Structure formats: structure tokens, C-alpha cells
Design a protein around this ligand. Structure first.
Ligand SMILES: OC[C@H]1O[C@@H](n2cnc3c(Br)c(Br)c(Br)c(Br)c32)C[C@@H]1O
Length: 329
């Protein structure tokens, strides 16, 4: 009785074979830099967990981004720091340049390399078929890297992908929701952002893995190739699942929860209905058809599975025919 357990089908045991220091972030000792090295220039915004600023590193006169954290648990901050340090230098992973103590907030301030980003809302409207494939491949490099390093991002979305379109450079940012994957571990389902939440989160299945990120990526791909951002545009977390079910169908949703011996919230009884699985072609029209190909639709179909175990891994995704036309570096 109770939920049937689940494991990642790749990188399952990466952390158990790393030194304890690698994943035991609660024991991490932070190496603090010199707070005087960074001059704040302008506020970029304020999120749930921090205030973000453009700044200058006065030791090299280079632009950097500074995130001054709102007060939060030392283990959560240590988790983000340890993950950033573990992944530093990896393909398309944002570089943590420094960590300093902000004397006003009395909290840590994380210092990142700057990316000359184009607002995704504006950028996505301009992406060609080739660009979408190219940047999707770049995101996959970052995801296969972090997964291979025992880490799931858990907040993949356009806002967390910074793109310098001029230099064709991409960085996956905002690792504050990321976690180490340990087989059999139950995780918080209150992660990711609504439109990018995987079915596992929406049905409260806690034993999830790297494959969560692949659902989120599929949501991004659908928004890009169909020019509809976000693709699954739910009004709340319940409606989010209904919107998904209107596309993937309710019978396969029941197959998913039945496999894992999960029950839907009874509040779905009055809102879920009965829906057939749709063919992806229904979302194609004259305004997005130039971004769609049989390869794109098959790739999307293989990312957006209810069953997290059935989704392409990041490495499998990079083997897909969709990327045959992308020039390899
Ligand atoms: O949000 C205002 C702009 O500044 C960029 N920006 C926002 N949050 C950012 C964060 Br958080 C990081 Br780390 C980096 Br690097 C950049 Br660049 C960020 C995106 C926008 O182009």
C-alpha cells in the first residue's frame, strides 16, 4: 500500500559514489569574498528569494549580477552555493564568481558572471526554426551536465535561461531550487513554476528525479515551436493538470497514477472530465508552421509524457533527429 517507489533510469547512484563532501551541503563551509569589490549599479528586480542587481566588479571593471538573498535557512543557502560550486565550469552553467556578506541585508550576496540577455518574451517571437533547435541543444548540454553530476534543477523555465543572442551564448541560471538526487528520497513537490510543473508535482508524487526537468523543457519547446507562451496556461495548480489532461488525455493520466498507486485529489472529480489524447498537429497553424517539422513533433511527444520514467533523458534527447540539422561545434 501507499505509493509505488521510483528511481531515475540514469545517473541513479552518482552521489552515493562521490565523496560525502560533494553532496552533504549542510556541512559546507562558505568561502567569503570581499564585499567591497562589488559596486551595485541598478536594481533589476525582486523575486521570491532575493533582490537582483547589475553591478561592477571594481577589481576588473567587469559587469556582474548580484543577488542579495532574502533571509532564508542556512542549509538552503548552502545547498545553492554547494550546487553552484559543484557545477562551476560545466557546459552552459552560470558561473558563481563570488559570495559576499551584504552589510545592509545581513544576508549573503551571490555574485554571477553577467550575460547580455534579450528578454525571452521579445526573443522568442524572433527565433527561427534553426535557432530553436540550436538553443534547445545548448540547454540540453547544461541539463545532461547537472544530471550527470547528481543534481536536478527543478525550476527550468524561460526566465532561468539567459541568452546572449549576439554571441549565441546560453546560461542556465537560478539554482536555488536545485537538489541532489538520491535514490528513494522523497522531495518537496512545491518546486518549479506553475506552467512548467511536471505531472509528478501536480499529483503529489514525491519520489521524482532528473526527469522532472525534461517535462519543463518540453513545456518550453512546445511554447517555442507553437509560438504560444506558456503552452499549458493554468489558472492554478489544479487547472494546470486539467490543461495538461486536455492534451495528453485522461486515460493516460489514470494509467500514470495507477502505475504509482497514487490517487488524485478528490477536488478533481468535478473539474477533470474525460479527454482523449490529442495529436500534436492540432496546434499547428499558418503562423507557427515554419517552426514545426515531423522531427520537432516527435521530439516534443517524447518529452511530454505523464510517466516521468518514460521521458527522454537529456542524453537521449541530444541523440534525437531534431538536432541533426544543428551544426556541431
Ligand atoms: O531582468 C532584467 C535583465 O537582467 C537579466 N537578468 C535578470 N536576472 C538575472 C540573473 Br538572476 C542573472 Br544570475 C543574470 Br547572469 C542575469 Br543577465 C539576469 C535578465 C534581463 O535581461
Amino acid at each position: 500500500s501507499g505509493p509505488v517507489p521510483s528511481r531515475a533510469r540514469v545517473y541513479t547512484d552518482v552521489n552515493t559514489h562521490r565523496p560525502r563532501e560533494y553532496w552533504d551541503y549542510e556541512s559546507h563551509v562558505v568561502e567569503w569574498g570581499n564585499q567591497d569589490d562589488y559596486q551595485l549599479v541598478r536594481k533589476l528586480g525582486r523575486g521570491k528569494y532575493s533582490e537582483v542587481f547589475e553591478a561592477i566588479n571594481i577589481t576588473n571593471n567587469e559587469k556582474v549580477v548580484v543577488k542579495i538573498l532574502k533571509p532564508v535557512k542556512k542549509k538552503k543557502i548552502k545547498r545553492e552555493i554547494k550546487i553552484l560550486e559543484n557545477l562551476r565550469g560545466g557546459p552552459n552553467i552560470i558561473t558563481l564568481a563570488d559570495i559576499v556578506k551584504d552589510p545592509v541585508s545581513r544576508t549573503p550576496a551571490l555574485v554571477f558572471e553577467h550575460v547580455n540577455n534579450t528578454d525571452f518574451k521579445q526573443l522568442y517571437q524572433t527565433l527561427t526554426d534553426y535557432d530553436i533547435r540550436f538553443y534547445m541543444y545548448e540547454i540540453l548540454k547544461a541539463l545532461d551536465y547537472c544530471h550527470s553530476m547528481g543534481i536536478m534543477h527543478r525550476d527550468v523555465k524561460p526566465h532561468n535561461v539567459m541568452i546572449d543572442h549576439e554571441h549565441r551564448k546560453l546560461r542556465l541560471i537560478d539554482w536555488g531550487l536545485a537538489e541532489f538526487y538520491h535514490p528513494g528520497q522523497e522531495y518537496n513537490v512545491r518546486v518549479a513554476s506553475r506552467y512548467f510543473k511536471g505531472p509528478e508535482l501536480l499529483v503529489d508524487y514525491q519520489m521524482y528525479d532528473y526527469s522532472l526537468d525534461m517535462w519543463s523543457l518540453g513545456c518550453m519547446l512546445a511554447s517555442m515551436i507553437f509560438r504560444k507562451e506558456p503552452f499549458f496556461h493554468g489558472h492554478d495548480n489544479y487547472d494546470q493538470l486539467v490543461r495538461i489532461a486536455k492534451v495528453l488525455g485522461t486515460e493516460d493520466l489514470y494509467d500514470y497514477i495507477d502505475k504509482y498507486n497514487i490517487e488524485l485529489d478528490p477536488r478533481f472529480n468535478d473539474i477533470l472530465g474525460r479527454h482523449s489524447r490529442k495529436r500534436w498537429e492540432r496546434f499547428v497553424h499558418s503562423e507557427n508552421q515554419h517552426l514545426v517539422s515531423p522531427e520537432a513533433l516527435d521530439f516534443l511527444d517524447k518529452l511530454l509524457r505523464y510517466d516521468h520514467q518514460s521521458r527522454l533523458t537529456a542524453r537521449e534527447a541530444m541523440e534525437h533527429p531534431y538536432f541533426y540539422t544543428v551544426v556541431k561545434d
